[PDB]
Amino acid sequence: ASLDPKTGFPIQGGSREKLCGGSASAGCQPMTQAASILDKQRTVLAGKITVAANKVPVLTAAVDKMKTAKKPKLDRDYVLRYSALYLTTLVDAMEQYCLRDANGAKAAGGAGLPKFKETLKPASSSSLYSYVDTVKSGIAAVSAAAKAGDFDGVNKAAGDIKTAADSFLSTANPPIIFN
Amino acid sequence: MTAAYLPSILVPIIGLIFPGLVMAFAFIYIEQDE
């Protein structure tokens, strides 16, 4: 029913073990599954978003410890290495969910292997692309604060990422597929 | 730790029952005439 905070795997059973012939009833058991391959890719992407967003307070809590110290330095390396790893992973996954949400099944491999000439609609024209823009601006803020030495700047910017990612999930309501 | 129950299940089995069974069955194999 939701995605595990740290693992990003479908957690709740959804209380759906229906064998139900005739109407499939989206029986979570395989061969009774009503979910498309596209829905399953969407749940994987949403799981990635959950891992990244739950990791966002780790940066917030680490930055708070840094500021509290006897002498404060704002480890630019930690802040950047968080942004290079966790934060970029968030943006790319959010972009991919938008791509599937807008072009449709073509992004699921209908058009073939990922190519330099993607023959589908881009990640734009999505109602949730605005949230991707928020995270992108926040990544820039996180880097800018780290270069400047602003402890408060990193914390606020990470909070902006957390709100934006949570907002993305709520509007999308990603299908929870356990198969 | 995820699936944190696994070491408390698998370590006694691997460390006690698994050698206890291979020693028991190896002894039978090495002490049989046929």
Binding site: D4, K6, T7, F9, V51 | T2, A3, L6
Partner: peptide, 30 residues
């Protein structure tokens, strides 16, 4: 992090390796 289901996938595939290891060992033993 790793889910428990992911651990269970590894236990399935390592079980498949245990079955193949027995068969290779029995073939070597003749």
């Amino acid at each position: 992090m790793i889910s428990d289901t992911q651990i269970f996938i590894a236990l399935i595939l390592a079980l498949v390796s245990l079955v193949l290891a027995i068969r290779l060992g029995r073939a070597l033993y003749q």
